[PDB]
C-alpha cells in the first residue's frame, strides 16, 4: 500500500493469511509461564479447579488452577491497533498484542487513552517530514498508532476546544521517554512554526540541560536524571509563542558517587576532554578524567558518547542561547571546582579528635574559581561557626564530618547551579508575548519497585501516585459524560479513590514525609527514632501501611514498612532518610561564598530577606494544580529487555511495567463500569443468529429482542441510545454462543440437503426393488429349468426342425 507505513501497519492480507489454525474459545487459553510470562495452551481435562493443558510450543502437559487461566483472543484480534476493542482484555492478552506488534517492528500501540511505545533500539523511518504530512489533523482512529497522533490531536484539541493540553510521558529508566518528549516537540514545531530561531533555542537548550542532567547508567547511555515539565505556549493564530521548563528531583547523589560501569553527569567529562584547551586554565583542570575522585569512580568512557565533540557543541549551545562569556565561563568554573573539592584531603589525629587539612593546592584552586579565601574556606570547613541565638557558636569537625561536608558542598552547589541554569534557559525562551494557551509535556520517572527501595523511590512512587490519581479522575469524567450522553447514566463514585488514602498517608499533616521533615530539625535524631515515631502514628491504624511480609522475589533487601500503592505494596527502608532529606551544609561556608566575588557564585549562595521533601511536595502541588486545569494525554514508554536488543521481548519485564505503567490499572478502573460497547447496527449484524425466530424482518429493537430472547442477565448489559454497553467478558460469551449456533445451523442445513437427496432417490429405490425382484425370480427359474431332468431330454429331443 504505502512506503511510509512500513513500520506502522502490517498486512490486512498477510494477517488474514494466518491459517495454521482455527480457534477454540473453549480450548485455547493463556497460562502462567516462568520464561515467557504466559503461554498458549489447549485445555485437556478438568477435575474441579485442576485444569490440565498442553503447550502448543513444546507440546507437554502441566496442571494449572482454573483461576490462573486467562482468556485468549481469537486470531482476528492479532496485532490490534487499539487493545480497548479486544474481546478479551487482560494481562496476557495485552502482553501478547504488544509482543506481536513489537516483533513485527511496530512500536506504537493504543489501549484506550494510553499510547504505548516500546523502545525499538534502532532508528526507524517513521519520523520523517513525509510521514508528518500524513498525520496532520487526522483523528487517532483513522490512521496507524503513532506518537505524532497524540501530539497532533493535542494541538487540534487546543485550537478546537480552547484549553490547555498536557501530555504525560512515563516509563522506567531506558524506556525512551526522553527521545519521545523530543519527538513531540519536533512535531509541534513543524506544524506551528513562526512564519537562531525560537525553535532553535528550544532545540539548543537540550545540549546544556543534558550536559548537567544526564549521565551513563547501566540502563541508559544518556539518562535524564531529573523530571522535566515543558510547556509550549501558542499565539491566537495557533503558532508557537514561547516555552518554559520545570525540573523535578535531580539526582544529586551522583555528583559525588558513581556505581561501577556508571559515570557522573556528562559535563564533568566534557570539561576534562581538552576539546577547548584554551579553557583548561580558566578552570584549572588537567584533561584527564580518571584523575579526579568525584568522577573516576565508575567507568570513564562511553561508546556512543564523544565527550570531545559534545563539549564543543555544548560550548556553542551556550553561545546560541545568548549566554555571556562571563556567564558561560562562570558555569565552567563552578563545575571545575567540584572536581577539586573531591581532591582535598585532610590530616586527622595530631593529639586530638579533631581534623586538619593536608595541603592547600586543592582548597586554593577551589577558593580561586569560587572567588573566596582558601584560608577562610578551610577554616570554616574545618572548625565551623554555627548560629546559636544571641551568641552563635563554633563546632568541631571530624575526619568523617569534614569529607562529608565537602560532598555536601558539591552536591548543594551543583543543584543550585542546575536550577540557575534552567532558570537562565527559561529567561531566554521567554519572548515577552503573554500567550493564549499552551500544551505541556511531562517527563518524569515512572512507578518502579526494586529489591531495596529508599527515600528516592518513595519520592518517585509518591509522584506517580498523585499522577495516576490524575488519570483515574480523567477516565472517570470521561466515562460519566459517556453514560449520561447515552441516557444510561448510573451510580458511580470516582476512580481517585483508594488512591487518596495512600497519598494522604504521605503528604498530609501527620503522615510519613511530614514526620520526616518534623524529625529533622532535631539534632540527636536516630534512624530508629524516625522509625519509632513512624510506627506510632500509622502502625496498627492504617490499612495502607503495614509490616514487611513474605519476600516476593529473589534478593529482596531489608525493609522497615510496606506501603500499598496502586501498583502494589512496596517495602521501603528508611535507613538514611534523615541525612538524605536535609543537606547538611556549612552555614559558615555558605556565608563566605555568599560574599564570594564571582557573580554566579554570589547569586548561587544569596540569602533571603529547604528540605528536599518539602521542596518537591510544593513543586508537585504546583505541577498537579496545573495538570488538573488541562486536557490530559498519556504516553506509556516501555522497555522490552535489559540488552538494548531490538525485537527481543522479556515478559517478566513488560508485565512488570504494565503493572506499574497504568494500563492494567486503567483496565481495572474501566471494568467497574461497562467496557466493551457495540452500536446496535453492529449488534444485529453480528448476533441475529442467536435469535432468528424472534426477528420480524428497528436497530436497538432487534438488539433488545436478541438480548431479552437470550434471557440476558440485566446486570450484564445496559442500553444506550446509540450503542449497547456490556460488562467485561460478556461479548466473549456471546461470541462462543455464536460459534456453536452458526456451526449447528450450518450442520442442520447440511443435513436438510442430505435429506433432500435421499428422498429424491426414494422413488427410484421403490422401483428398482420390484425390478431386481423380477430378475432374481426369473433368473432362478431358467436355472432350475435347465436343471430339470425332463427338460434336458425334452429339449435334447429338439434337434430336427
Amino acid at each position: 500500500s504505502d512506503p511510509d507505513f512500513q513500520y506502522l501497519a502490517v498486512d490486512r492480507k498477510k494477517l488474514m493469511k494466518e491459517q495454521t489454525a482455527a480457534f477454540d474459545g473453549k480450548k485455547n487459553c493463556w497460562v502462567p509461564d516462568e520464561k515467557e510470562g504466559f503461554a498458549s495452551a489447549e485445555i485437556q481435562s478438568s477435575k474441579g479447579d485442576e485444569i490440565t493443558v498442553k503447550i502448543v510450543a513444546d507440546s507437554s502437559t502441566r496442571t494449572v488452577k482454573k483461576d490462573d487461566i486467562q482468556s485468549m483472543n481469537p486470531p482476528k484480534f492479532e496485532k490490534l491497533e487499539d487493545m480497548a476493542n479486544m474481546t478479551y482484555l487482560n494481562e496476557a492478552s495485552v502482553l501478547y498484542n504488544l509482543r506481536s506488534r513489537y516483533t513485527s517492528g511496530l512500536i506504537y500501540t493504543y489501549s484506550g487513552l494510553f499510547c504505548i511505545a516500546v523502545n525499538p533500539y534502532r532508528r526507524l523511518p517513521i519520523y520523517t517530514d513525509s510521514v508528518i504530512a500524513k498525520y496532520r489533523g487526522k483523528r487517532k482512529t483513522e490512521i496507524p498508532p503513532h506518537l505524532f497522533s497524540v501530539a497532533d490531536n493535542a494541538y487540534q484539541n487546543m485550537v478546537t476546544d480552547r484549553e490547555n493540553q498536557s501530555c504525560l510521558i512515563t516509563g522506567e529508566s531506558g524506556a525512551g521517554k526522553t527521545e519521545n518528549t523530543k519527538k513531540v516537540i519536533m512535531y509541534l514545531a513543524k506544524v506551528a512554526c513562526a512564519v537562531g530561531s525560537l525553535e532553535d533555542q528550544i532545540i539548543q537548550a537540550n545540549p546544556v540541560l543534558e550536559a548537567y542532567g544526564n549521565a551513563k547508567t547501566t540502563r541508559n547511555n544518556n539518562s535524564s536524571r531529573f523530571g522535566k515539565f515543558i510547556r509550549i505556549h501558542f499565539g491566537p493564530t495557533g503558532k508557537i509563542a514561547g516555552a518554559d521548563i520545570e525540573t523535578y528531583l535531580l539526582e544529586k547523589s551522583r555528583v559525588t558517587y558513581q556505581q561501577s560501569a556508571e559515570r557522573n553527569y556528562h559535563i564533568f567529562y566534557q570539561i576534562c576532554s581538552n576539546a577547548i584547551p584554551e579553557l583548561n586554565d580558566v578552570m584549572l583542570v588537567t584533561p584527564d578524567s580518571g584523575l579526579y575522585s568525584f568522577i573516576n569512580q565508575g567507568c570513564l568512557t562511553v561508546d556512543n558518547i564523544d565527550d570531545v565533540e559534545e563539549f564543543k557543541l555544548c560550548d556553542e549551545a551556550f553561545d546560541i542561547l545568548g549566554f555571556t562569556k562571563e556567564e558561560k565561563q562562570s558555569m565552567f568554573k563552578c563545575t571545575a571546582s567540584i572536581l577539586h573539592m573531591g581532591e582535598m584531603k585532610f590530616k586527622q589525629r595530631p593529639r586530638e579528635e579533631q581534623a586538619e587539612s593536608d595541603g592547600t593546592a586543592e582548597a586554593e584552586k577551589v577558593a580561586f574559581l569560587c572567588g573566596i579565601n582558601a584560608g577562610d574556606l578551610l577554616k570554616a570547613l574545618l572548625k565551623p561557626k554555627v548560629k546559636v541565638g544571641t551568641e552563635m557558636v563554633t563546632k568541631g569537625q571530624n575526619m568523617n564530618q569534614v569529607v562529608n561536608s565537602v560532598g555536601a558542598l558539591a552536591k548543594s552547589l551543583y543543584d543550585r547551579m542546575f536550577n540557575w541554569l534552567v532558570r537562565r534557559v527559561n529567561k531566554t525562551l521567554d519572548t515577552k508575548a503573554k500567550r493564549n494557551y499552551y500544551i505541556g509535556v511531562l517527563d518524569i520517572a515512572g512507578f518502579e519497585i526494586f529489591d531495596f527501595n529508599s527515600f528516592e523511590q518513595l519520592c518517585i512512587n509518591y509522584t506517580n501516585e498523585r499522577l495516576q490519581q490524575f488519570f483515574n479522575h480523567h477516565m472517570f469524567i470521561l466515562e460519566q459524560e459517556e453514560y449520561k450522553k447515552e441516557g444510561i447514566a448510573w451510580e458511580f463514585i470516582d476512580f481517585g479513590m483508594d488512591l487518596q488514602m495512600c497519598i494522604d498517608l504521605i503528604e498530609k499533616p501527620m503522615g510519613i514525609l511530614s514526620i520526616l521533615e518534623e524529625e529533622c530539625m532535631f539534632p540527636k535524631a536516630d534512624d530508629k527514632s524516625f522509625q519509632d515515631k513512624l510506627y506510632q502514628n500509622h502502625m496498627g491504624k492504617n490499612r495502607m501501611f503495614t509490616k514487611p511480609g513474605k519476600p516476593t522475589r529473589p534478593n529482596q533487601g531489608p525493609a522497615h514498612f510496606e506501603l500499598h500503592h496502586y501498583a502494589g505494596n512496596v517495602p521501603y527502608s528508611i535507613t538514611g532518610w534523615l541525612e538524605k532529606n536535609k543537606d547538611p551544609i556549612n552555614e559558615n561556608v555558605v556565608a563566605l561564598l555568599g560574599a564570594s566575588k564571582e557573580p554566579l557564585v554570589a547569586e548561587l549562595f544569596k540569602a533571603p530577606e529547604q528540605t528536599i521533601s518539602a521542596v518537591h511536595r510544593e513543586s508537585l502541588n504546583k505541577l498537579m494544580k496545573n495538570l488538573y486545569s488541562t486536557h490530559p494525554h498519556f504516553v506509556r514508554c516501555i522497555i522490552p529487555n535489559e540488552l538494548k536488543q531490538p525485537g527481543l521481548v522479556d515478559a517478566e519485564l513488560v508485565l512488570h511495567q504494565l503493572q506499574c505503567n497504568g494500563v492494567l490499572e486503567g483496565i481495572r478502573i474501566c471494568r467497574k463500569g461497562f467496557p466493551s460497547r457495540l452500536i446496535y447496527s453492529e449488534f444485529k449484524q453480528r448476533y441475529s443468529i442467536l435469535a432468528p425466530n424472534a426477528i420480524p424482518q428497528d436497530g436497538k429493537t432487534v438488539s433488545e429482542k436478541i438480548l431479552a430472547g437470550l434471557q440476558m442477565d440485566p446486570a450484564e448489559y445496559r442500553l444506550g441510545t446509540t450503542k449497547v454497553f456490556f460488562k467485561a467478558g460478556v461479548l466473549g460469551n456471546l461470541e462462543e454462543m455464536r460459534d456453536e449456533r452458526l456451526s449447528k445451523i450450518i450442520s442442520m442445513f447440511q443435513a436438510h440437503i442430505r435429506g433432500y437427496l435421499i428422498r429424491k432417490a426414494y422413488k427410484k429405490l421403490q422401483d428398482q426393488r420390484i425390478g431386481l425382484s423380477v430378475i432374481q425370480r426369473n433368473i432362478r427359474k431358467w436355472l432350475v429349468l435347465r436343471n430339470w431332468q425332463w427338460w434336458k431330454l425334452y429339449s435334447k429331443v429338439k434337434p430336427l426342425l
Binding site: 443435513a751 440437503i753 428422498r759 429424491k760
Partner: protein, 155 residues
C-alpha cells in the same frame, strides 16, 4: 415421541425397502440408519445418528426392525433448522447485505464448515435444485434455501 401406528407403518414401509437393498433378512445396516430416517421426513445430523446407534461404515452392525423404533423415536427429538436459522447463517457470509454470495463461498461453507458435505454431494444438489449462478459468479441463497427445504418434489 409416542408414535402413531400410522407413522410406525410408514416406518415399516421404509424399513422393509432398505432391508431388501442389502439382503432381505429383517436386518438393516446401521450405515443406513440415518438414510432410513430421512426417507421419513426427518433431517438428522451426522452426530444425531451416531448418538443413537448409527455407524461410520458398512458391514459393522445390522439392526432388526424392533431396534429401529427406539432409534427413530430418538432422532425425532433433534433440532430441525428453520428458515430464519438458515437465513441468518448465510446472512453472516453476506457483506453488502443484498442477499448474494459467491458460489465458491457457498461450496466453501458446505464442504468446509460443520459436518462437511462431499464435493460430489454439493455438485449433486445444485443440479437438482438448479441454483443458477449469475454473470459475476454469485447466487441468491434465499432461493437456494427454499428449494433445499421445498424438497425434490414441489407443489
Amino acid at each position: 415421541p409416542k408414535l402413531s401406528q400410522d407413522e410406525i407403518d410408514d416406518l415399516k414401509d421404509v424399513f422393509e425397502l432398505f432391508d431388501f437393498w442389502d439382503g432381505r433378512d429383517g436386518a438393516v445396516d446401521a450405515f443406513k440408519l440415518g438414510d432410513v430416517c430421512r426417507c421419513l421426513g426427518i433431517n438428522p445430523r451426522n452426530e444425531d445418528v451416531f448418538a443413537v446407534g448409527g455407524t461410520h461404515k458398512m458391514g459393522e452392525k445390522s439392526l432388526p426392525f424392533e431396534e429401529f423404533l427406539p432409534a427413530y423415536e430418538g432422532l425425532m427429538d433433534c433440532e430441525q433448522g428453520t428458515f430464519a436459522d438458515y437465513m441468518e447463517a448465510f446472512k453472516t457470509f453476506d457483506r453488502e447485505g443484498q442477499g448474494f454470495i459467491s458460489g465458491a463461498e457457498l461450496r466453501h461453507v458446505l464442504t468446509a464448515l460443520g459436518e462437511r458435505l462431499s464435493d460430489e454431494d454439493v455438485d449433486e444438489i445444485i443440479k437438482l435444485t438448479d441454483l443458477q449462478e449469475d454473470l459475476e459468479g454469485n447466487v441468491k441463497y434465499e432461493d437456494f434455501v427454499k428449494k433445499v427445504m421445498a424438497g425434490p418434489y414441489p407443489d
